[PDB]
Structure formats: C-alpha cells, structure tokens
Coordinates of C-alpha atoms in Angstrom, one line a residue:
Chain A
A1 CA -7.6 5.3 89.0
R2 CA -11.0 5.7 90.6
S3 CA -12.9 2.4 91.1
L4 CA -16.1 1.7 89.2
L5 CA -17.7 -0.4 92.0
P6 CA -17.1 1.5 95.2
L7 CA -20.5 1.0 96.8
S8 CA -20.4 -2.8 96.3
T9 CA -16.8 -2.7 97.4
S10 CA -17.8 -1.1 100.7
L11 CA -20.5 -3.6 101.4
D12 CA -18.0 -6.4 100.8
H13 CA -15.5 -4.9 103.2
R14 CA -17.6 -4.7 106.3
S15 CA -18.2 -6.7 109.5
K16 CA -17.7 -10.5 109.8
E17 CA -21.2 -10.6 111.2
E18 CA -22.5 -9.0 108.0
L19 CA -20.3 -11.2 105.8
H20 CA -21.8 -14.4 107.3
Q21 CA -25.4 -13.2 106.5
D22 CA -24.3 -12.8 102.9
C23 CA -23.2 -16.5 102.6
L24 CA -26.5 -17.8 103.8
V25 CA -28.7 -15.6 101.6
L26 CA -26.4 -16.4 98.6
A27 CA -26.6 -20.1 99.4
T28 CA -30.4 -20.0 99.4
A29 CA -30.4 -17.9 96.3
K30 CA -28.2 -20.5 94.5
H31 CA -30.8 -23.3 95.3
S32 CA -33.3 -22.9 92.4
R33 CA -32.6 -13.3 92.7
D34 CA -34.2 -14.0 96.1
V35 CA -32.9 -11.1 98.2
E36 CA -33.9 -7.5 98.1
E37 CA -31.7 -5.5 100.5
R38 CA -28.5 -7.3 99.5
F39 CA -28.1 -5.9 96.0
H40 CA -24.3 -6.3 96.2
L41 CA -24.7 -10.1 95.9
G42 CA -25.4 -9.6 92.2
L43 CA -21.7 -10.2 91.7
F44 CA -22.2 -13.8 92.8
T45 CA -25.8 -14.5 92.0
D46 CA -27.2 -13.9 88.5
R47 CA -27.0 -11.4 85.6
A48 CA -30.4 -9.8 86.4
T49 CA -29.1 -9.0 89.9
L50 CA -25.7 -7.9 88.6
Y51 CA -27.5 -5.4 86.4
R52 CA -29.4 -4.3 89.5
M53 CA -26.1 -3.8 91.3
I54 CA -24.6 -1.9 88.3
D55 CA -27.6 0.4 88.0
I56 CA -27.4 1.3 91.7
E57 CA -23.6 1.9 91.2
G58 CA -24.1 4.0 88.1
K59 CA -26.8 6.1 89.7
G60 CA -24.4 6.5 92.6
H61 CA -21.7 7.8 90.3
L62 CA -24.2 10.4 89.0
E63 CA -25.1 11.6 92.5
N64 CA -21.4 12.2 93.1
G65 CA -21.0 14.2 89.9
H66 CA -19.1 11.5 88.0
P67 CA -21.0 10.8 84.7
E68 CA -17.8 9.5 83.1
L69 CA -17.9 6.6 85.6
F70 CA -21.6 6.1 85.0
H71 CA -21.0 5.8 81.3
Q72 CA -17.9 3.6 81.6
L73 CA -20.0 1.2 83.7
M74 CA -23.0 0.9 81.4
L75 CA -20.7 -0.3 78.6
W76 CA -20.2 -3.5 80.4
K77 CA -24.0 -4.3 80.1
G78 CA -23.5 -4.1 76.4
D79 CA -26.1 -1.5 75.3
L80 CA -23.5 0.8 73.7
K81 CA -26.0 2.4 71.4
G82 CA -28.3 3.1 74.4
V83 CA -25.5 4.7 76.4
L84 CA -24.5 6.9 73.5
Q85 CA -28.1 8.0 73.0
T86 CA -28.4 8.8 76.7
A87 CA -25.0 10.5 76.8
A88 CA -25.9 12.7 73.9
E89 CA -29.2 13.7 75.5
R90 CA -27.4 14.7 78.7
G91 CA -24.6 16.6 77.0
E92 CA -22.0 14.3 78.5
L93 CA -20.5 12.9 75.3
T94 CA -16.7 12.6 75.5
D95 CA -13.7 11.5 73.4
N96 CA -13.6 8.2 75.3
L97 CA -17.3 7.6 74.6
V98 CA -16.8 8.3 70.9
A99 CA -13.7 6.2 70.8
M100 CA -15.9 3.1 71.6
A101 CA -18.8 4.1 69.4
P102 CA -17.5 2.2 66.3
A103 CA -18.1 -1.0 68.3
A104 CA -21.7 -0.7 67.0
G105 CA -20.6 -0.1 63.5
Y106 CA -19.4 2.8 61.3
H107 CA -22.9 4.3 61.1
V108 CA -23.1 4.6 64.9
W109 CA -19.7 6.3 65.0
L110 CA -20.8 8.8 62.3
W111 CA -23.9 9.6 64.4
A112 CA -21.7 10.0 67.5
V113 CA -19.1 12.3 66.0
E114 CA -21.9 14.6 64.7
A115 CA -23.6 14.5 68.1
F116 CA -20.3 15.2 69.9
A117 CA -19.7 18.0 67.4
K118 CA -23.0 19.7 67.9
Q119 CA -22.5 19.4 71.6
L120 CA -18.9 20.8 71.4
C121 CA -20.3 23.9 69.7
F122 CA -22.5 24.5 72.7
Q123 CA -19.4 24.0 75.0
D124 CA -17.6 26.8 73.2
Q125 CA -15.0 24.5 71.6
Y126 CA -15.4 25.3 67.9
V127 CA -11.9 24.3 66.8
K128 CA -12.2 20.9 68.5
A129 CA -15.7 20.4 66.9
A130 CA -14.0 21.4 63.5
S131 CA -11.5 18.6 63.9
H132 CA -14.3 16.0 64.6
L133 CA -16.2 17.1 61.5
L134 CA -13.0 16.6 59.6
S135 CA -12.8 13.1 61.0
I136 CA -16.1 12.2 59.3
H137 CA -15.0 13.7 56.0
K138 CA -17.1 16.9 56.2
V139 CA -14.5 19.4 55.2
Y140 CA -16.8 22.1 53.9
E141 CA -19.2 21.8 56.8
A142 CA -16.2 22.0 59.2
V143 CA -14.9 25.1 57.5
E144 CA -18.2 26.9 57.3
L145 CA -18.6 26.3 61.1
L146 CA -15.3 28.1 61.9
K147 CA -15.9 30.9 59.5
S148 CA -19.4 31.4 60.9
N149 CA -17.9 31.8 64.4
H150 CA -15.2 34.2 63.2
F151 CA -12.4 31.6 63.4
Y152 CA -11.0 32.8 60.1
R153 CA -7.4 31.9 60.7
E154 CA -8.0 28.2 61.6
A155 CA -10.7 27.9 58.8
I156 CA -8.2 29.1 56.2
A157 CA -5.6 26.6 57.4
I158 CA -8.1 23.8 57.2
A159 CA -9.4 25.0 53.8
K160 CA -5.9 25.5 52.4
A161 CA -4.7 22.0 53.5
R162 CA -7.6 20.0 52.2
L163 CA -9.0 21.9 49.2
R164 CA -7.5 22.7 45.8
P165 CA -5.9 26.2 45.8
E166 CA -8.6 27.7 43.5
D167 CA -11.6 26.5 45.5
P168 CA -14.1 29.4 45.7
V169 CA -14.5 28.5 49.4
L170 CA -10.8 29.1 50.1
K171 CA -11.0 32.4 48.2
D172 CA -14.2 33.4 50.0
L173 CA -12.5 33.0 53.3
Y174 CA -9.7 35.5 52.4
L175 CA -12.4 37.9 51.2
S176 CA -14.8 37.3 54.1
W177 CA -11.8 37.8 56.5
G178 CA -10.5 40.8 54.6
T179 CA -13.8 42.8 54.6
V180 CA -14.2 42.2 58.3
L181 CA -10.7 43.5 59.0
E182 CA -11.2 46.4 56.7
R183 CA -14.3 47.2 58.6
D184 CA -12.4 47.4 61.9
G185 CA -9.4 49.3 60.7
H186 CA -6.9 46.5 60.2
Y187 CA -5.8 47.6 56.7
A188 CA -2.4 45.9 56.7
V189 CA -3.8 42.5 57.6
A190 CA -6.8 43.0 55.3
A191 CA -4.3 43.5 52.4
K192 CA -2.7 40.1 53.2
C193 CA -6.2 38.6 52.9
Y194 CA -6.9 40.3 49.6
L195 CA -3.4 39.2 48.4
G196 CA -4.2 35.6 49.5
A197 CA -7.4 35.8 47.3
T198 CA -5.3 36.9 44.3
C199 CA -6.9 40.3 44.4
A200 CA -3.8 42.6 44.3
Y201 CA -5.6 45.8 43.2
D202 CA -7.9 45.6 46.3
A203 CA -4.9 44.7 48.4
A204 CA -3.2 48.0 47.4
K205 CA -6.4 50.0 47.9
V206 CA -7.2 48.9 51.4
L207 CA -3.6 49.5 52.4
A208 CA -4.1 53.1 51.1
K209 CA -7.1 53.6 53.4
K210 CA -4.9 54.1 56.5
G211 CA -3.8 57.5 55.1
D212 CA -0.4 57.8 56.6
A213 CA 2.9 58.0 54.6
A214 CA 4.2 54.5 55.4
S215 CA 0.9 52.9 54.3
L216 CA 0.7 54.8 51.1
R217 CA 4.3 54.1 50.2
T218 CA 4.0 50.3 50.7
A219 CA 0.6 50.4 49.0
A220 CA 2.4 52.0 46.0
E221 CA 5.3 49.5 46.1
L222 CA 2.7 46.7 46.3
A223 CA 0.9 48.0 43.2
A224 CA 4.2 48.3 41.3
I225 CA 5.2 44.7 42.1
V226 CA 1.9 43.4 40.8
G227 CA 2.0 45.6 37.7
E228 CA -0.9 48.1 38.3
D229 CA 1.6 50.9 37.7
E230 CA -1.1 53.4 37.0
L231 CA -2.4 52.9 40.5
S232 CA 1.1 52.7 41.9
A233 CA 1.8 56.2 40.5
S234 CA -1.5 57.5 41.8
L235 CA -0.7 56.2 45.3
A236 CA 2.9 57.4 45.1
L237 CA 1.6 60.9 44.4
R238 CA -0.8 60.7 47.4
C239 CA 2.2 59.6 49.5
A240 CA 4.3 62.7 48.8
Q241 CA 1.3 65.0 49.4
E242 CA 1.0 63.8 53.0
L243 CA 4.6 64.6 53.7
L244 CA 4.0 68.3 52.8
Chain B
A1 CA -9.3 26.4 74.5
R2 CA -5.6 27.0 73.8
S3 CA -4.9 28.1 70.3
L4 CA -3.5 25.7 67.7
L5 CA -1.4 28.4 65.9
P6 CA 0.5 30.4 68.6
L7 CA 3.7 31.2 66.8
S8 CA 2.2 32.3 63.5
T9 CA -0.5 34.3 65.3
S10 CA 2.1 36.1 67.4
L11 CA 4.1 37.2 64.3
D12 CA 1.0 38.6 62.7
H13 CA 0.5 40.8 65.7
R14 CA 3.5 43.0 65.3
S15 CA 4.3 46.6 64.5
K16 CA 3.0 48.1 61.3
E17 CA 6.5 48.0 59.9
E18 CA 6.5 44.2 60.0
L19 CA 3.1 43.8 58.4
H20 CA 4.1 46.1 55.5
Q21 CA 7.2 44.0 54.8
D22 CA 4.8 41.0 54.9
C23 CA 2.6 42.5 52.2
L24 CA 5.6 43.2 50.0
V25 CA 7.0 39.7 50.4
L26 CA 3.5 38.3 49.8
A27 CA 2.9 40.3 46.6
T28 CA 6.2 39.0 45.2
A29 CA 5.2 35.4 46.0
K30 CA 1.7 35.5 44.4
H31 CA 3.3 37.0 41.3
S32 CA 4.8 33.7 40.3
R33 CA 4.9 31.7 37.1
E34 CA 8.0 29.7 37.8
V35 CA 9.9 34.1 52.1
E36 CA 11.9 31.7 54.2
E37 CA 12.3 33.8 57.4
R38 CA 8.6 34.7 57.3
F39 CA 7.2 31.2 57.8
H40 CA 3.9 32.7 59.1
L41 CA 3.1 33.7 55.5
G42 CA 2.3 30.1 54.6
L43 CA -1.2 30.8 55.6
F44 CA -1.6 33.3 52.7
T45 CA 0.6 31.7 50.0
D46 CA 0.5 28.0 49.1
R47 CA -0.1 24.5 50.6
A48 CA 3.6 23.6 50.6
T49 CA 4.4 26.7 52.7
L50 CA 1.4 26.1 54.9
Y51 CA 2.6 22.6 55.8
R52 CA 6.0 24.1 56.5
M53 CA 4.3 26.5 59.0
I54 CA 2.3 23.7 60.5
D55 CA 5.4 21.6 61.0
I56 CA 7.0 24.5 62.7
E57 CA 3.9 24.9 64.9
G58 CA 3.8 21.2 65.7
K59 CA 7.5 21.4 66.6
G60 CA 6.7 24.2 69.0
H61 CA 3.9 22.1 70.6
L62 CA 6.2 19.1 71.2
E63 CA 8.8 21.4 72.8
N64 CA 5.9 22.8 75.0
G65 CA 4.9 19.2 75.8
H66 CA 1.3 19.5 74.7
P67 CA 1.0 16.6 72.2
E68 CA -2.8 16.8 72.0
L69 CA -2.4 20.0 70.1
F70 CA 0.3 18.5 68.0
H71 CA -2.3 15.8 67.1
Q72 CA -4.9 18.3 66.0
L73 CA -2.6 20.0 63.5
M74 CA -1.6 16.7 61.8
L75 CA -5.2 15.8 61.3
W76 CA -5.5 19.0 59.3
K77 CA -2.7 17.9 56.9
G78 CA -4.5 14.7 56.3
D79 CA -1.9 12.7 58.1
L80 CA -4.0 10.8 60.6
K81 CA -2.5 7.4 59.8
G82 CA 1.0 8.9 60.2
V83 CA 0.3 10.6 63.5
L84 CA -1.4 7.5 64.9
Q85 CA 1.7 5.4 64.2
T86 CA 3.8 8.2 65.7
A87 CA 1.8 8.6 68.9
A88 CA 1.8 4.8 69.4
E89 CA 5.6 4.6 69.0
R90 CA 5.9 7.5 71.6
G91 CA 3.1 6.3 73.9
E92 CA 1.1 9.4 73.4
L93 CA -2.2 7.9 72.2
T94 CA -5.4 9.4 73.6
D95 CA -9.2 9.0 73.6
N96 CA -9.3 11.9 71.2
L97 CA -7.0 10.1 68.7
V98 CA -9.0 6.9 68.9
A99 CA -12.2 8.8 68.4
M100 CA -10.9 10.1 65.1
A101 CA -9.1 7.0 64.0
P102 CA -12.0 5.6 61.9
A103 CA -11.4 8.6 59.5
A104 CA -8.5 6.5 58.2
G105 CA -10.6 3.4 57.9
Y106 CA -12.4 1.0 60.2
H107 CA -9.3 -1.2 60.4
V108 CA -7.2 1.7 61.6
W109 CA -9.5 2.3 64.6
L110 CA -9.4 -1.4 65.3
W111 CA -5.6 -1.1 65.2
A112 CA -5.5 2.0 67.3
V113 CA -7.8 0.5 70.0
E114 CA -5.3 -2.4 70.3
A115 CA -2.2 0.0 70.6
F116 CA -4.1 2.2 73.1
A117 CA -4.9 -0.8 75.2
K118 CA -1.3 -2.0 75.2
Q119 CA -0.3 1.5 76.2
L120 CA -2.9 1.8 79.0
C121 CA -1.5 -1.4 80.6
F122 CA 2.0 0.1 80.7
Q123 CA 0.4 3.1 82.5
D124 CA -1.5 0.7 84.8
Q125 CA -5.0 1.7 83.8
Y126 CA -6.2 -1.9 83.4
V127 CA -10.0 -1.3 83.8
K128 CA -9.8 1.3 81.0
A129 CA -7.6 -1.0 79.0
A130 CA -10.2 -3.8 79.4
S131 CA -13.1 -1.5 78.5
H132 CA -11.4 -0.7 75.2
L133 CA -10.9 -4.4 74.5
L134 CA -14.7 -4.7 74.9
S135 CA -15.2 -2.1 72.2
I136 CA -13.4 -4.4 69.7
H137 CA -15.3 -7.5 70.9
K138 CA -12.5 -9.2 72.8
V139 CA -14.3 -10.2 76.0
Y140 CA -12.1 -13.2 76.9
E141 CA -9.0 -11.0 76.5
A142 CA -10.4 -8.2 78.6
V143 CA -11.4 -10.6 81.3
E144 CA -8.0 -12.4 81.3
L145 CA -6.3 -9.0 81.4
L146 CA -8.1 -8.0 84.6
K147 CA -7.8 -11.4 86.2
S148 CA -4.1 -11.6 85.5
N149 CA -3.7 -8.2 87.2
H150 CA -5.7 -9.1 90.3
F151 CA -8.9 -7.2 89.3
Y152 CA -11.1 -10.1 90.1
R153 CA -14.0 -7.9 91.2
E154 CA -14.2 -6.1 87.8
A155 CA -13.2 -9.3 85.8
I156 CA -16.2 -11.1 87.2
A157 CA -18.6 -8.1 86.6
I158 CA -17.7 -8.1 82.9
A159 CA -17.7 -11.9 82.5
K160 CA -21.1 -12.1 84.2
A161 CA -22.4 -9.4 82.0
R162 CA -21.0 -10.7 78.7
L163 CA -20.5 -14.5 79.2
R164 CA -23.1 -17.2 79.9
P165 CA -23.7 -18.6 83.4
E166 CA -22.1 -21.9 82.5
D167 CA -19.1 -20.5 80.7
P168 CA -16.0 -22.2 82.1
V169 CA -14.2 -18.8 82.3
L170 CA -16.8 -17.5 84.8
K171 CA -16.3 -20.4 87.2
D172 CA -12.5 -20.2 87.0
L173 CA -12.7 -16.6 88.0
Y174 CA -14.7 -17.3 91.1
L175 CA -12.4 -20.2 92.1
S176 CA -9.2 -18.2 91.2
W177 CA -10.4 -15.3 93.4
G178 CA -11.4 -17.5 96.3
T179 CA -8.1 -19.3 96.3
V180 CA -6.4 -16.0 96.8
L181 CA -8.8 -14.8 99.4
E182 CA -8.4 -18.1 101.3
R183 CA -4.6 -17.9 101.1
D184 CA -4.8 -14.5 102.8
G185 CA -7.2 -15.6 105.5
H186 CA -10.2 -13.8 104.2
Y187 CA -12.4 -16.8 104.8
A188 CA -15.9 -15.4 104.6
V189 CA -15.3 -13.7 101.3
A190 CA -13.7 -16.8 99.9
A191 CA -16.9 -18.7 100.6
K192 CA -19.0 -16.5 98.3
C193 CA -16.6 -17.2 95.4
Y194 CA -17.0 -20.9 95.8
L195 CA -20.8 -20.4 96.2
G196 CA -20.6 -18.2 93.1
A197 CA -18.9 -21.1 91.3
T198 CA -21.6 -23.6 92.5
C199 CA -19.2 -25.2 94.9
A200 CA -21.3 -25.1 98.1
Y201 CA -19.6 -28.2 99.5
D202 CA -16.2 -26.5 99.3
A203 CA -17.7 -23.2 100.4
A204 CA -18.8 -24.6 103.7
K205 CA -15.3 -26.1 104.4
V206 CA -13.5 -22.8 103.8
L207 CA -15.9 -20.9 106.0
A208 CA -15.1 -23.4 108.8
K209 CA -11.4 -22.8 108.5
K210 CA -11.9 -19.6 110.4
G211 CA -12.6 -21.8 113.4
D212 CA -14.6 -19.6 115.8
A213 CA -18.1 -20.4 117.1
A214 CA -19.9 -18.1 114.6
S215 CA -18.0 -19.4 111.5
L216 CA -18.7 -23.1 112.2
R217 CA -22.3 -22.2 113.0
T218 CA -22.9 -20.4 109.7
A219 CA -20.9 -23.1 107.8
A220 CA -23.2 -25.8 109.3
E221 CA -26.3 -23.9 108.3
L222 CA -24.9 -23.3 104.9
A223 CA -24.2 -27.0 104.4
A224 CA -27.8 -27.7 105.6
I225 CA -29.3 -25.3 103.0
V226 CA -27.4 -27.1 100.2
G227 CA -28.4 -30.6 101.3
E228 CA -24.9 -31.8 102.4
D229 CA -26.6 -32.9 105.7
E230 CA -23.8 -35.3 106.5
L231 CA -21.3 -32.4 106.5
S232 CA -23.7 -29.9 108.1
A233 CA -23.8 -32.1 111.2
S234 CA -20.1 -32.7 111.2
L235 CA -19.5 -28.9 111.4
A236 CA -22.4 -28.2 113.8
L237 CA -20.8 -30.7 116.3
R238 CA -17.4 -29.0 115.9
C239 CA -19.4 -25.8 116.7
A240 CA -20.4 -27.4 120.0
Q241 CA -16.7 -28.2 120.8
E242 CA -15.9 -24.5 120.6
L243 CA -18.7 -23.8 123.1

C-alpha cells in the first residue's frame, strides 16, 4: 500500500548531518512551533505544526494526481464534514469517502450519498448511482433516473423487486419501454413489454406490425391464448394472405 | 460499466424464433388465476420469478469472480443485511458495501465498519483499517493497531491529531518507537522520539551512544539547551577525547 507520509518520510531518511540539526531545533522548540523550514518536525513538536506537515503532504498528494491519498490524510485532522464538502466540490467523492461519512451522523451520510449519486451521473455510471439512491430509500427517484437515461431493463428489475406488482410506475416502464422498441422496429420485444404491463391486445397488435408470416401466426396464437379470439381470427386471416 | 444482467440480456438477443416462443410462454403465464427453462422471463412475469433470475445472475457473477456485481444485485432484492453477513464470512467486504450499509440501519454500518477493519488487517492494509476505526470513533484502538504493527509514524500522526498533548498514549508511542530505533542503531532518529516524549535527558544520552565526534558534540549542545548543564559538560569533554 502507498504511504500517506512520503515527503516527511524522505526528510527523516536523509543524512546524519541533517538529522543532527533536527534534534537541536526540536530541542529548542520543546523549551517553551519555532522553526519554519523544518516542517517535518510537526510529527514531534505540536499539533499546529503536525497540521502544517499534513497540509504540505496532502497538497503533495494532489500534485502527484492522488486525491484519494489527500482525502484519506485529511480525515486524521477530524474535519470529516469539511473533507466531504471539498471532495464533492472537486468531483472526487468515492465509496471509501462515503463509507466514512456516517461518522458525522446519518444526516451527513444522506447528504453524501446524494452528492456521490449526482456526481456518478456525470461520470456515466447511472446503474451505480441507482444503487446508491436505493441505499437512501429513494426507490422511485432511483427508477426514474434509469428510465430517463434509457436503462429500461435495470429500472424494471429495480421496480419489480421493490414495488407492489400493480404500481403504475412498474406498468409505465413496460409501456415506456414498449413504445420505444415499437418505434425502432423491435416488435417481438415490444410485445413482451406490453404483456408485462397486462396489455395483451396491444401485445398481439405490435407483433402483427412486422408483417411476415411467423409474426402474424404467433400474434394470432397470442391473441387466442389471451381470449381475444375475434382479433386472433383477424390476424390468422392476415397470416394466410401473406403466404399466397 | 459492466452490465449487471449479462445472462438474461444475452437470451433476449436471440433469433426471432426464440422471442416468439417467449411471447407465447409469457401470455400463458400472465393469464393466471391459480416457464422454467426460460428464466430470463422473470423480468416480465412476477417477483418470485425475477428473484429466481437474479439468483441465477448472481450465481454467474460468483463463478466469474466479480463479487462487486453480485453485491449490487442483492441490494435490489432488499437483502443488504444478508449480503453484508455473506461478504463478511467470505472476506469480500468493500468500500461500496460499507457506503450502503446504513440503508439497513445505523448499527449495521457500525457493524460493517468493524468487520471490514478486521478483514483489512488480514489483508495487511493497516493504515486503511485504522482509518475506518476512526470513522466509528475508536481512536485508541486505531492507534494501538498501527503501533502493534510497527506503523509508529502513522500511529503518532493520528494520536497527535486526535489525542491531547499530555495523553499517556502519545508519550508511550514516542518511547516505544525510540526503543526500537535505538535497538537497531538508528541513534539520531531515536533522540527525536525521546525529545517528542519530553525526555530530553534520555535523548542526549542516546545521541551520544553513536560515539563519533559529531554525535557527542550535538548531544552536548542538546543537553545545554535543556538546562542539564552537568550532563552537557560531561558529553562535551568526551567529545574532546574523540578529538
């Protein structure tokens, strides 16, 4: 694992001449934050100097493109709510950061998950964002997100597993997905959606839109199973016509 | 962004023959007042058949070895408590899982943070393990975990940041680290530990153990700064002997 104090570790592993200067400055500092150059003494001096050292180390992690290490270091200082607010602003929120957010209370975790969710939408991870909105008990909001971004399959699975079977939302997903597929010429899959919404007539009709013989036969058999025999006959007729 | 429903998605993308048989099988099912081979139909039928499909999909993920996607599917079923217990028993906990644990209650997150720390130690990620112990307000346990694993540098950084200057645990860290540095011959670094513990008298002695002209010299000036003038002279005259 990568160390969180590499700069200070380097200045502690240098010449014996350099080490001896540290003892004398530190000794004078103890007789009472005195030094300026030797920031790495904050490990042995006082908290105000330790924080100085940490800030230098954190900023150093940033300049190497390691914001994860910056954030993991700022937790030690104790300002979790401040790190999260900064992490959200920078778009560097992560699972590890959200895992520790409840340390400030349930209300800070709620804020963090929403923040991490909004950010995850920008990062093109709508399914992961959907899971996090589920974690804060926002099932409808999570489902509307996936639907809005054309993740109909995953949205239906979330809506079917959490909502009562007759929820108009669950039905609207089948419809909303069906129309879209109908639009783009996927009549077979569209029928499955209309069937899922308990709309058997429309399931048979969209399947008839393809026009071929196989589609019209199955569409007829589908209408017979359901009990719309008048339509099943009408589609059975249209099936035999194509074969001529 | 790997899909969470590979197997079912694959079956839905098949020849027109297959989707037509699906429609027939599906129409029969919906017409029910009171199927198996087509597990992918659970998305369109009922919750009981959906769960069956998810379980099949989760089984496929565990065969693939991608448990983070196995975890997403179980959150959908509303089985977060179950999958947390499962991932703990198998050592598959993640930051993702702990980030969602509060969904099952504040005390489940508190439980998951502990099990994730115990797991991170097994995997020898002690600084991360300690950081997560700080999230549940266990400072002394995080400091003792790092100390006991020879992470004195990080153990002091946390103690100094969270504990008070006169906390006995902070002094014992400095002394404990110095004892190890002195045992290995790192005499200059050992002095700073003793100085960090407000043991200037013992810090000058250790710096003299080195024995060369520069060590005794600095050790003598160090004792002078403190006010241990009796000792300062003793070392500055041994400094002369070397010269």
